[PDB]
Swiss-Prot record:
NCBIfam families: PRK09558.1. This is Protein UshA. Degradation of external UDP-glucose to uridine monophosphate and glucose-1-phosphate, which can then be used by the cell. Gene3D superfamilies: 3.60.21.10, 5'-Nucleotidase, C-terminal domain. Substrate binds at residues 350-354, 473-479. InterPro entries: 5'-Nucleotdase_C, 5'-Nucleotdase_C_sf, 5'-Nucleotdase_CS, 5_nucleotidase/apyrase, Calcineurin-like_PHP_ApaH, Metallo-depent_PP-like. GO terms for biological process: nucleotide catabolic process. GO terms for molecular function: 5'-nucleotidase activity; metal ion binding; nucleotide binding; UDP-sugar diphosphatase activity. Zn(2+) 2 binds at residues 59, 91, 192, 227.
Length: 525
């Protein structure tokens, strides 16, 4: 670079896109509006003599039925048009076989990076560790890192000869390699690890904060995050804002001279970090999260509702609409499949699933027990994302109930472990995502103790073995649930939640909702 010259570099970033190539039903986000917003920033920055780098934190896959059944092709092709420069591989990039991810690398005109994923038998990386970019006369290196929880979280069949090494140890080696060979002026890490307040990861694998602390001071200009699905806006030192408002200022986190940013999810925001480079120094001038046609739900006293833009409308780029429309129609044609029927509504509403036992909880858990041969089951009410109306059931309806690509697991445990496990789970309160939905369990919860506890209408025998079904999420500590993944009787089946529910509905159709009707088997006080 030129000695003493001040350079302008804008880093644009998104993460956890999760199939949101199209605007939602309220006209929010979508890649068409993202394209207009990004095009306008490129033009403004170019007129100032600056540079733009557009990065993704990964998890493009899974989350919208139209996208899922097309293996995120519209998302990857849309990202080429927005003009993404690099992407970190996320854990949801492993929801599909490795061959599908290879085809996503063919569709993407930008590299999909991960330095820490290795073939066990050969000791070779499966992906490119980093990519290099020339911006003005500056050399910028982008490193990709994936959470080492991936194999633990996903389908085990996909990881037999694959290992996810500790991303922080891998980042140290990659930084040192780059400093010794390519000598970039700027190093950025695009990651899919998550942001945890003060590095308090809990049951999750260590994330961004912990990694930034372990690295040499300021060795990375920034960590472009993802995974945790949070707008990284600090309320105080080592504390992110709870319930961040779109359009408000966003103070990103800084740990050991390294900025840590995240742009929430679903293309809702484009994060913008404006930096100035001079003589090796990188200084952040401004940081913002730009809403992408986000709308506030406004409810009048007469009960009438409307959705209103927080900021002025971003027009949808027509070239993006022409690219995406055929995939939106193809996605719909693929979703036009009747998988079964129900004689009644299956209650999946938030104000029900997080408060009381519902027939949708019983249906999902019946599907999970049937696939695993389980005696009983439990799941977080927060894992039930929609209802199924009376009548015909489409694959789309099933995907809306279970949209996250969770995996079905089971654990064989003693009656004593069953007693201890259900006692801790019964402590989860209503009005929370952690509120438990049970199947084949009955008790009267009183003073943190379970009375008349039964499995399949029978008292729990401590010596007896019982199989419980749940999701990978809960089994690994999700929502503060007791860990099952470290128990000897644990088995991760690899089966997706939506596929298990779909197939069970198919073979049990027509559903008689009376069979799934909760009758106060579990109660508190
Ligand atoms: C991950 C994969 C291939 C499996 C599924 C059923 S579970 C869906 C349709 C969500 N998907 O995109
Ligand atoms: Zn993730
Ligand atoms: Zn995610």
């Amino acid at each position: 670079y030129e000695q003493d010259k001040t350079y302008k570099i804008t880093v644009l970033h998104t993460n956890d896109h999760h199939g949101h190539f199209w605007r939602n039903e309220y006209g929010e986000y979508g890649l068409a509006a993202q394209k207009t917003l990004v095009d306008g920033i490129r033009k403004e920055v170019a007129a100032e003599g600056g540079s733009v780098l557009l990065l993704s934190g990964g998890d493009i896959n899974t989350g919208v039925p139209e996208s899922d059944l097309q293996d995120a092709e519209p998302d990857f092709r849309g990202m080429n048009l927005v003009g993404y420069d690099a992407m970190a591989i996320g854990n949801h990039e492993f929801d599909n076989p490795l061959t599908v991810l290879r085809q996503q690398e063919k569709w993407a005109k930008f590299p999909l990076l991960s330095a820490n994923i290795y073939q066990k038998s050969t000791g070779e990386r499966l992906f490119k560790p980093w990519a290099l970019f020339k911006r003005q006369d500056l050399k910028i290196a982008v490193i990709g890192l994936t959470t080492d929880d991936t194999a633990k979280i996903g389908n085990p069949e996909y990881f037999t000869d694959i290992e996810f090494r500790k991303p922080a140890d891998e980042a140290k080696l990659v930084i040192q390699e780059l400093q010794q060979t390519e000598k970039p002026d700027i190093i950025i890490a695009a990651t899919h690890m998550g942001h945890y307040d003060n590095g308090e990861h809990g049951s999750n694998a260590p994330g961004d904060v912990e990694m930034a602390r372990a690295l040499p001071a300021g060795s990375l200009a920034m960590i472009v995050g993802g995974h945790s699905q949070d707008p990284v806006c600090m309320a105080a030192e080592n504390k992110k804002q709870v319930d961040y408002v779109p359009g408000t200022p966003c103070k990103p986190d800084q740990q050991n001279g390294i900025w840590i940013v995240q742009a929430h999810e679903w293309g809702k925001y484009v994060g913008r970090a404006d930096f100035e480079f001079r003589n090796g120094e990188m200084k952040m001038v401004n940081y913002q999260l730009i809403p992408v046609n986000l709308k506030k739900k406004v409810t009048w006293e007469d009960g009438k509702s409307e959705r209103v833009l927080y900021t002025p409308e971003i027009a949808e780029n027509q070239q993006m609409i022409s690219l995406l429309s055929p995939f939106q129609n193809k996605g719909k044609a693929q979703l036009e499949v009747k998988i079964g029927e129900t004689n009644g509504r299956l209650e999946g509403d938030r104000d029900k699933v997080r408060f009381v036992q519902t027939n949708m909880g019983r249906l999902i858990l019946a599907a999970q027990m049937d696939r695993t041969g389980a005696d009983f089951a439990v799941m977080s009410g927060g894992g039930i994302r929609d209802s199924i109306e009376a009548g015909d059931i489409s694959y789309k309806n099933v995907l809306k109930v279970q949209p996250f690509g969770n995996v079905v697991v089971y654990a064989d445990m003693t009656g004593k472990e069953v007693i201890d496990y259900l006692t801790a789970v019964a402590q989860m309160k209503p009005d929370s995502g952690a509120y438990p939905q049970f199947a084949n369990v009955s008790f009267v919860a009183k003073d943190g103790k379970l009375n008349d506890l039964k499995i399949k209408g029978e008292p729990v025998d401590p010596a007896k073995t019982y199989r419980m079904a749940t999701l990978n999420f809960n089994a690994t500590g999700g929502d503060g649930y007791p860990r099952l993944d470290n128990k000897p009787g644990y088995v991760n089946t690899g089966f997706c939640d939506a596929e298990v529910l779909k197939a069970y509905i198919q073979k049990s159709s027509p559903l008689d909702v009376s069979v799934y009707e909760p009758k106060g088997e579990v109660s508190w006080q």
